[model samples]
Target: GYFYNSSFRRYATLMGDLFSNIQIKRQLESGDKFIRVPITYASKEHFMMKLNKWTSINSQEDVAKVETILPRINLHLVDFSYNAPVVSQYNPSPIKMIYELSIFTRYEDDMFQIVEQILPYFQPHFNTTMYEQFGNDIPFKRDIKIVLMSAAIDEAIDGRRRIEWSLTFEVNGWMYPPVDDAEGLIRTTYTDFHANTRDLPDGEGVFESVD
Candidate 1:
């Protein structure tokens, strides 16, 4: 199912309940406007690159198509350099280089294929055990979440698909350790695409043509 927020934190309780219900899948599939998928991170740089591509204004439409389906997915990268100072304060050193990527897509099949094509390029830094334990435990300073909403879809005069979408996101905190001598608190920046268009729309609509 599609999630309205990143990290699914704002609606974590609702999501947990949704996951528990047997009809959740049916509800998710009933609509052509939404899709949800789970994406696993393989590497920091690779994930960041994809994130950059998706967030770019130029690709807004394509990105929105992807959001229609897998409405909520996460991406993360960990920087070991930043964790060195916090080693003493926190156990397991909080994955120094950590980046999280989450997406809301409307095109499930296409986006799933796209993620599959790109995932193998990035090798996962942590094993399953690490991911289960320390990976999930570490607290992030900046948690960025993006939401995309479709505004319109039309078959245009040029015989191309015309679509509109919007994006909004937030960042929670900043990286870098606090020091008495420090000048300023490191600020984490969150960027969101608020445009109102997209390129492609996949799957079936509520109303269909008669045979």
Candidate 2:
């Protein structure tokens, strides 16, 4: 019950993919400019690395347009008081975390459309299933928590994006413990214990009796 493999990796991929098929018409009310503008997504930590490269590929072309990815997910541990963890498990009593997901856009209209597209599902909180049990444990379904925490508009220039925008989301998940934790309890049947002086943090400290 304490160890588990999770979706931390796929979570990022799935979040970046929210707007993969976004379409923006050369965006005008006129009939003459009615052509589908090609927009794509890339997994970029920063969206502007290839900003000027858009012009490099222009064969003296009509309009230089391409969309890249800027997906940022950061985790900060918070208080676990909110989680009513069971005392019998090897897992910790409190497993609390915050995940921030940022979605970047190159167009104002595109941002609005993408924002609207995902909002209906948030209902404030979205649920997912994560695999439970790590290394020596069996994999199984466990609930995952996600939500739309907040949204902000970029000033058109951050690291990249000719016309940039941002959408921030928050998520809650477990930072599953490492394999050695052993759920914090007994494995060996020995009644006696041995101590290696080198393993002690206090090199000069002396050891005596067992509790």
RMSD of each: 17.9, 17.1
TM-score of each: 0.23, 0.47
Residue ranges of candidate 2 with Cα displaced over 4 Å: 1-7, 17-45, 52-106, 131-138, 157-161, 178-211
How much is the lDDT of residue 63 in candidate 2? Answer: 55
Candidate 2 clashes between residue pairs 3 or more apart in a chain or in different chains: 3-133, 3-134, 4-133, 4-134
TM-score result, candidate 2: 0.47
lDDT of 1 by residue, 178-200 (tens): 23212322211222122222211
What is the lDDT for 181 in model 1? 18
Each prediction's Cα lDDT score? 0.28, 0.38
Q: Model 1 lDDT vs. the true structure?
A: 0.28
Q: Which candidate's TM-score is highest?
A: 2
In Å, residue 75's CA in model 1 sits off its true spot by 1.8
Query: Per-residue lDDT of 36-100 in model 2, one digit per residue for the tens?
Result: 22222333333234434442446644253343222222122222324554543345323434433
